[PDB]
Amino acid sequence: FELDAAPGASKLRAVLEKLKLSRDDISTAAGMVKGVVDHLLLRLKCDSAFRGVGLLNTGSYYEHVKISAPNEFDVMFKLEVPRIQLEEYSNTRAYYFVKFKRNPKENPLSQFLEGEILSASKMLSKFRKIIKEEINDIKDTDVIMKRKRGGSPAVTLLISEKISVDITLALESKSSWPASTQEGLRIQNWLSAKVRKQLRLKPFYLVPKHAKEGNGFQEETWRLSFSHIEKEILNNHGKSKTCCENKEEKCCRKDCLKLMKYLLEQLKERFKDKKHLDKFSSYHVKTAFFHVCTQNPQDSQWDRKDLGLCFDNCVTYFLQCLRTEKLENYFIPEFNLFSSNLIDKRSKEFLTKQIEYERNNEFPVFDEF
Ligand SMILES: [Zn+2]
């Protein structure tokens, strides 16, 4: 009587199975999304200022941030900016003003300048104007641009009555990464020092994002973004180069991340009307997950048969971050995602209590709605 996995796997596996089943009907939605995105890119490429715009995840017009919202897509439009000088905003480590190494009108971004600073406000404004005008050239399909909520999901489109596409504009820089990332990406004992060096030769991105305090915000800051690196690591994630390419090396890392995301999504959905959980996002869960991979670098610590314990360990790490109010950005270690300035103690304790209940009760929230 050999078990297929150690106890606790089956319920989690049935959850995973159900989540994938929700993706077996996508090709359609994906199609409409690709059509819209390609149209937009064509129009934006005609503007002198956005002439270099392109898909970040090359050949990928989809990237679901919410494991349980298959009709919600996330795409990033990146634009190379030949030579920027970053200036860190008030030692925040993650937020910067964007300035330029030279002055005249050869970079078509001069129109977005405010003094010497590149205005995220102005650029976003043009981006949105171009997009709205373009989705209006769509005659037999109601593509609606949703109203502003912020800067970095820049634009949300509602296609028909079922599909949404969040479009993020990002500046791309091919300079070496800012000094605040110097001690981050601590993958040396997991994915290797040579991999870390290789990754850090890739460009980095900047997305418009107000850096706000308790008081208010400086409207023209940009936040560092490494979503391309996160994707690369998640899909090439083992110490072994052949991790998950055969039966002997099947690991549960990806499934643990999916389960953490689903847990957070289910709880946020249950409590959405009372904003207790508004400030938590899949990005916190993904960041915590990468730290757990650093803490457990060997593939044998993620054997698929041990899904139950691996997931429990993920939950436990996330709880520890909540209780101690510390979750370091994986690329920028002095940027604390769970500081009291960003998320009130009360919200963290609330989430802690919900997750602890779930974990003590075999995760009934996975089944409830
Ligand atoms: Zn693997």
Task: Tell me the CA–centroid distance for residue 21 and ligand 1, in Å.
Answer: 21
Q: How many CB atoms lie within 10 A of CB 164?
A: 17
Q: Distance from the CA of 174 to the center of ligand 1, in angstroms?
A: 30
Tell how far the Cα of 71 is from the centroid of ligand 1, in angstroms. Answer: 27
Cα–Cα distance for residue pair 246/237, rounded to 1 Å: 14
Protein residues placing their CB within 5 Å of the ion ligand 1:
238, 243-244, 251
List binding-site positions. Answer: 58, 60, 72-74, 166, 209, 223-230, 237, 243-244, 251, 261, 282-286
State which approach was used to obtain the coordinates: X-ray
Domains and CATH numbers, the chain: 1-21+177-203+226-369 (1.10.1410.40), 22-176+204-225 (3.30.460.90)
Residue in 294, 88, 289, 281 with CA at minimum distance from that of residue 185:
294
216 DSSP assignment? -
Nearest CA to 119 out of 54, 210, 213, 205 is that of 210
Q: Cβ(18)–Cβ(70) under 8 Å?
A: no
- Name the residue type at position 203: P
Contacts of 186 (CB under 8 A, 6+ apart): 294
Do you know the residue count of the chain?
369
Q: What separation in Å is there between the alpha carbon of 236 and the centre of ligand 1? A: 8
By C-alpha distance, which of 78, 4, 1 is closest to 252?
4
User: Which stretches of 136-226 are DSSP H helices?
Assistant: 193-200
CA–centroid distance, 305 to ligand 1, in Å, is 12
* CB neighbourhood size of 323 (10 A): 13
Q: How far apart are CA 110 and CA 342, in angstroms?
A: 33
Q: Identify the bridge partners of residue 72 per DSSP, sorted by sequence position.
A: 164
d(CA 269, CA 99): 40
**Alpha carbons within 13 A on the beta-carbon side of 66:** 17
**Ligand 1 geometric centre to CA of 234 (Å):** 9
User: Known binding site for 2',3'-cGAMP: residues?
Assistant: 74, 166, 209, 223
